[PDB]
């Protein structure tokens, strides 16, 4: 099985409509204020839930 017809630019873009990344769960670190992923140790200050680790 091989493409009977080449994919046009519009169809290619349509198919790629859902081909994208996302960035979720970023919020201010309570200790230093730098953004961090929720439920993760802040990479800047090393704190989590108000304690250094």
């Amino acid at each position: 099985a091989v493409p009977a017809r080449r994919t046009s630019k519009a169809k290619k873009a349509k198919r790629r409509t859902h081909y994208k990344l996302t960035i979720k769960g970023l919020n201010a670190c309570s200790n230093c204020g730098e953004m961090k992923k929720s439920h993760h140790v802040c990479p800047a200050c090393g704190h989590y839930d108000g304690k250094d680790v």
Binding site: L21, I23, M35
Partner: protein, 111 residues
């Protein structure tokens, strides 16, 4: 006088994959862009982060702009020179390989 650009040329990365990341940061404050790039694990994230930081450094040192107010006004990836390689496939034939490169440009304005 109000905006500064930085560019990384002939960077070894996929233009489409780089655009995936760039679409995130385009049109957002510098702090948000920095956080997004830092916490994005995709390879191109680090390169785009370096380019954006260089752009901010230029907007400050060269043009004495207000860093805290900066916003990423423009950002895009263009195709660069493509290195050709060959991978030997089955039954004695070869298949071409396109090792692609990117021109990553980031323009940041005062507001």
């Amino acid at each position: 006088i109000t905006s500064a650009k930085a560019t990384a040329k002939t960077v070894r990365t996929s233009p489409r994959k780089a655009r995936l990341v760039i679409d995130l940061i385009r049109g957002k404050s510098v702090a948000d862009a920095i956080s997004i790039l830092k916490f994005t694990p995709n390879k191109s994230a680090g390169i785009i982060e370096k380019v954006l930081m260089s752009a901010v450094a230029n907007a400050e040192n060269n043009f004495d702009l207000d860093v805290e107010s900066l916003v990423v006004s423009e950002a895009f990836v263009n195709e660069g020179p493509t290195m050709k390689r060959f991978r030997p496939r089955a039954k004695g034939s070869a298949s071409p390989i396109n090792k692609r490169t990117s021109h990553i440009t980031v323009v940041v304005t005062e507001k």
